[PDB]
């Protein structure tokens, strides 16, 4: 204990107690602690702790700023050495070499291990969370000065290693196993972008290109974008850019499906529209794009659409069953969805919405801090829980599809803007009022509306042309 530095010269060597660090229930699992005690354990002298390092660096922004973290780990690194013993003081003032038995042991067993673990944190930080340094150039400048002024022979390996990663990540900012299938076309010709629409593009190719787009959006989301509900906080655009792209696509696609349905006023044409969206669902199913399946389900369950009982009546029984089964994936807390996801073979796109729901429940169901003996301790178990949910996301992020990109169709779906200049709440009110117009509530009769589509409504089907 007293081999470690005193509190007046070093902040990371206070003894553990119930009022600064708590454990759960082998390396021990940290339940809670002060940021200082978290940093101490993040760079503990007795052993490496890769699980804690990973979980810490994913979740630390919910209790500590990047700049503050960098200051703390540098402070941890700057360990003062103990004074020479009385015999060695006498040796030094006589011009001789001191024994320095404890000093040498302390360097070997405490200073050197801790410093190596600070550099390990730096390496993991730049490798797996380089976006911190991209968003804050001053933070990177601080890291490079720190790493550049480290001195040592054991240390230089780690320095070069860390510098190696920093350069790859800067250079990044400046495939296909088999042959993919033929790109399917229906009414719209290749290049004639002005005619691209729900019924004119081939439903297979709609599902394929949306799956490519959604796969890409799924794979770009970093775990830290979900932590501490930061995508709902005021800094959402900087902290959760990829997450917000995913959410906005889902909103635009879902609301586009609804718009296509309710703005098709002719009953028989609207049946064709609903039927084509179910075919797009079928192809999402074939591709294991569960995100896409549940986007269609979401549109079909929306207030404006779900009430359109005259439309659904004409949908063939086989398509009815496909849509009904898709809904049932969501019943009993996504029981059948989860059973489906663990059974299928790659590639897939998981339903992203369920992670957000479960993370929000975890964030709202657990406190930010714990209290022991009148002192606040950061609730790290809360963060680990959230990190475990983000871990589930990550395990499906390296599943590329063997499908050819079609740049014009991709762009059409990237540029979907069903709301126009309207806000969402007012737009869904408009969709609902449209639904009341096309199929009035039960006492009123059902009026007829003229056709809007000049081209054939017959679907080309969902079986691919080899
Ligand atoms: C009654 N409206 C039927 C309807 C008209 C227009 C277009 C689509 C459809 C359509 C037919 S089945 C369906 C799917 C997506 N949804 C559902 N499926 C099943 C089996 N059960 C549900 C049970 C629900 O609450 C108890 C529910 O609440 C939203 C949705 C369910 C949607």
Swiss-Prot record:
Expressed in gingival tissues. Residues 202-441 form the Ras-GEF domain. Residues 26-170 form the N-terminal Ras-GEF domain. Changing residue 206 to T: In a patient with Noonan syndrome. It comes from the Eukaryota. Interacts (via C-terminus) with GRB2 (via SH3 domain). Forms a complex with phosphorylated MUC1 and GRB2 (via its SH3 domains). Interacts with phosphorylated LAT2. Interacts with NCK1 and NCK2. Part of a complex consisting of ABI1, EPS8 and SOS1. It is linked to Fibromatosis, gingival, 1: A form of hereditary gingival fibromatosis, a rare condition characterized by a slow, progressive overgrowth of the gingiva. The excess gingival tissue can cover part of or the entire crown, and can result in diastemas, teeth displacement, or retention of primary or impacted teeth. GINGF1 is usually transmitted as an autosomal dominant trait, although sporadic cases are common. Promotes the exchange of Ras-bound GDP by GTP. Probably by promoting Ras activation, regulates phosphorylation of MAP kinase MAPK3/ERK1 in response to EGF. Catalytic component of a trimeric complex that participates in transduction of signals from Ras to Rac by promoting the Rac-specific guanine nucleotide exchange factor (GEF) activity. This is Son of sevenless homolog 1. It comes from Homo sapiens (Human). The chain holds residues 566 to 1044 of 1333 of the full protein.
